[PDB]
């Protein structure tokens, strides 16, 4: 396809964006999502085994000559009060994936995200103070809608535009620093800058 543009509210469509996805492997994007989700997960689920428990290390009653079944400890993993046999422990979940597989995964979701995608021309010279009002006005100009979800790819992120953008929850401003695979799936409408197209078209083509 070919993408659209917006000077400041009016179209003049040009830049094309070439990028390399696979063919019969959406599975690559799935894997790249799953890895992302796993490595993040904090993993703070902690239980005590029968060793670690605060409890008496002693036979309560003798082995023979009572009708009771032979007991080892009272903090045993069959009584309530101390046990938890194969219980979770403070455990890391960080799995590897290759470099090129991650990069390819990032490329494929973006490649399939053009269609919904969008581009603008620089607009950092508008905002002198930080203003959310003007920002939302510019959203409704472009027609991105405070209801729907959006991801602003912005090659060089400016202070005043970032601060105005912060408190819109549905919105999500991203440098190439904090580029994310989860997010490019998260968004309904992507919205690039001319520099961004040069970056992605160069780096992933």
């Amino acid at each position: 396809p070919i993408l659209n543009f917006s000077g400041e509210k009016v179209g003049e469509t040009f830049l094309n964006l070439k990028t390399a996805p696979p063919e019969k492997a959406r599975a690559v994007v799935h894997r790249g999502l799953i890895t992302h989700l796993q490595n993040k997960r904090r993993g703070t689920a902690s239980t005590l085994t029968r060793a670690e428990v605060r409890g008496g290390g002693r036979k309560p009653y003798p082995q023979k000559k009572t009708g009771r079944a032979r007991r080892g400890s009272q903090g045993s993993p069959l009584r309530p009060g101390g046990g938890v046999i194969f219980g979770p422990k403070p455990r890391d979940w960080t799995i590897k994936m290759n470099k090129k597989e991650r990069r390819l995964a990032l490329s494929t979701a973006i490649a399939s995200a053009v269609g919904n995608s969008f581009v603008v021309e620089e607009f950092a010279e508008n905002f002198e103070k930080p203003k959310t009002k003007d920002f939302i006005a510019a959203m409704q100009r472009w027609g991105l809608d405070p209801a729907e979800k959006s991801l602003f790819f912005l090659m060089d992120l400016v202070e005043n535009v970032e601060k105005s953008g912060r408190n819109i929850r549905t919105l999500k401003l991203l440098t190439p620093r904090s580029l994310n695979l989860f997010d490019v799936l998260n968004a309904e409408k992507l919205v690039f800058t001319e520099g961004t197209i040069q970056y992605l078209n160069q780096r992933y083509g």
Partner: peptide, 14 residues
């Protein structure tokens, strides 16, 4: 058809 967190799944057998 565009990729989202709705759509994704593994390939058969992996």
């Amino acid at each position: 058809t565009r990729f989202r967190l709705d759509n994704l799944g593994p390939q058969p057998g992996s």
